[PDB]
């Protein structure tokens, strides 16, 4: 098992005409494998949809992925933006 | 386009870690 593989490759043809959005060298980086898309970094380790207690076939279409991400209320953020200045 | 072997970009791990950024230390004329 080696560590020093390249995994980043550049085609010699300069196609930098419509390429202002991708990841450039500063040429285009062409990796060996695809990317990883992660939804949220912080998990909600409580929240009994995930905790599964052992008391008492049901579905629940929860609104989006933002239930499991620990977001603060706008009341405190306004209380903190008043604490800003 | 499938005969277009690309250029590998080598990291050279010692260059990744601590390279800084000699006449300017004036003891060598």
């Amino acid at each position: 098992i080696m560590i020093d593989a390249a995994s980043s490759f550049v085609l010699p043809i300069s196609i930098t005409k419509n390429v202002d959005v991708l990841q450039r060298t500063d040429e285009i980086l062409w990796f060996r494998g695809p990317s990883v898309i992660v939804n949220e970094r912080i998990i909600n380790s409580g929240d009994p949809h995930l905790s599964l207690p052992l008391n008492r076939n049901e579905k629940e279409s929860l609104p989006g992925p933002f239930v499991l991400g620990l977001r603060p209320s706008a009341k405190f953020t306004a209380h903190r933006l008043s604490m800003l200045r | 386009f499938e005969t277009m072997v690309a250029n590998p970009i080598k990291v050279s791990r010692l260059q990744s870690n601590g390279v800084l950024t000699i006449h300017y230390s004036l003891a060598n004329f």
């Binding site: - | 300017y24 230390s25 004036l26 003891a27 004329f29």
Partner: protein, 83 residues
């Protein structure tokens, strides 16, 4: 490191024969010297003065030379042409 030695520069004969310094010994900002200006403790700033890198480039290394009730003062003239 990064320290200049205290000796080993005697660029004086070149200034004896520099023909701009008014020395009668031999014949054949806006300051010149930073003796009123600081340099923010970087020794490269003294190379911007023209009479100082003149002593760093045209300089030499010397070895140090090593060695009555009423004075009678007699002025002695020395006039020798030499090459």
């Amino acid at each position: 490191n990064q320290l200049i030695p205290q000796a080993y520069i005697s660029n004086f004969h070149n200034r004896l024969t520099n023909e701009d310094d008014g020395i009668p010994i031999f014949t054949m900002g806006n300051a010149v010297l930073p003796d009123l200006q600081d340099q923010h403790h970087n020794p490269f700033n003294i190379l911007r003065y023209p009479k100082i890198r003149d002593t760093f480039i045209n300089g030499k290394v010397v070895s140090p030379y090593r060695l009555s009730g009423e004075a009678i003062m007699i002025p002695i003239t020395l006039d020798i042409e030499h090459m």
